[PDB]
Amino acid sequence: NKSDAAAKQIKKLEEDFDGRIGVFAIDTGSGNTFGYRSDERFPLCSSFKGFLAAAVLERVQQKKLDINQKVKYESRDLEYHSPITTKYKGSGMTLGDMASAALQYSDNGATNIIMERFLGGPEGMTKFMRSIGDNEFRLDRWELELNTAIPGDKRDTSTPKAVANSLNKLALGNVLNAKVKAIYQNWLKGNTTGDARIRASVPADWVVGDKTGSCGAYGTANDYAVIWPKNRAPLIVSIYTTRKSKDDKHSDKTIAEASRIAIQAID
Numbered sequence: 001n002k003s004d005a006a007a008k009q010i011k012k013l014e015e016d017f018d019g020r021i022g023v024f025a026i027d028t029g030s031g032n033t034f035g036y037r038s039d040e041r042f043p044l045c046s047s048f049k050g051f052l053a054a055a056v057l058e059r060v061q062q063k064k065l066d067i068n069q070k071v072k073y074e075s076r077d078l079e080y081h082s083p084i085t086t087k088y089k090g091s092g093m094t095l096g097d098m099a100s101a102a103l104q105y106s107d108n109g110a111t112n113i114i115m116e117r118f119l120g121g122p123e124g125m126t127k128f129m130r131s132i133g134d135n136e137f138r139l140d141r142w143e144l145e146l147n148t149a150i151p152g153d154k155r156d157t158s159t160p161k162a163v164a165n166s167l168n169k170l171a172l173g174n175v176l177n178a179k180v181k182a183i184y185q186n187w188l189k190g191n192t193t194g195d196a197r198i199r200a201s202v203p204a205d206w207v208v209g210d211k212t213g214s215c216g217a218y219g220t221a222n223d224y225a226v227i228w229p230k231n232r233a234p235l236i237v238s239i240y241t242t243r244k245s246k247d248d249k250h251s252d253k254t255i256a257e258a259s260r261i262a263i264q265a266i267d
């Protein structure tokens with residue numbers, strides 16, 4: 001009933017912006033789910049940075065890494081959109097700070113440094129996801145080549161459902177112990193790039209942790225979030241979009257409205 005209405009609403013949204021909208025949402029209190037194109041492939045863009053952060057914390061918890069160890073990169077040619085790492089280039093940053101910058105500011109320098117030094121590159125990132133039982137995710141390339149988002153290209157893609165299920169496992173499940181999971185949640189809650197996406201779709205007094213992606217091409221953008229409503233079990237929302245042409249720009253408002261629709265479908 002409410003599921004079918006919601007589907008018609010997304011379908012009309014995606015025709016209105018001349019693109020493709022992928023949705024998966026989970027109410028963890030009731031078990032209700034809503035899906036639209038949830039098994040189709042969408043570019044990850046920066047959204048996998050949220051998982052990269054979790055992988056770091058997994059290593060830290062195993063004591064293979066110290067959250068406080070210094071990461072130096074004084075000679076590096078910092079990638080475009082390294083807002084945080086560019087400021088600390090001279091002094092270095094703790095591992096914890098680098099990982100949270102990758103997440104909360106989508107810092108590309110942080111991303112590539114962490115993947116080259118600690119995660120074993122895209123293949124290692126992919127292995128981490130396989131290890132939690134995510135079979136859809138694949139990371140093939142580095143920043144910034146991974147943001148191309150060419151129609152038909154399966155590199156650097158996942159599906160809305162797998163993204164949602166993965167976030168649930170990492171943010172709410174048992175891959176990270178109690179202490180390290182709490183850090184992960186606070187990193188997600190401090191994301192800075194998501195104000196006009198899922199955050200814009202819920203009451204202001206709900207607590208949200210999210211991670212956005214913006215490929216900068218093919219109108220390709222996304223957002224996934226854990227949402228703690230007041231006095232009630234958490235929700236998980238995964239929103240992915242692509243557009244037909246290279247020069248097409250992404251639509252924050254579309255993402256926010258798809259969010260609104262998904263949330264309605266599962267409440």
Ligand SMILES: *[B@@]1([O])OC2=C([C][C]1[N]C(=O)[C][C])[C]=[C][C]=C2C([O])=O
Nearest residue numbers: 045046081106147212213214215216
């Ligand atoms: B990304 O996907 O996320 C992000 C960036 C960097 C990444 N995209 C690019 O580097 C393309 C130029 C920059 C601003 C915002 C975002 C975001 O929404 O995550």
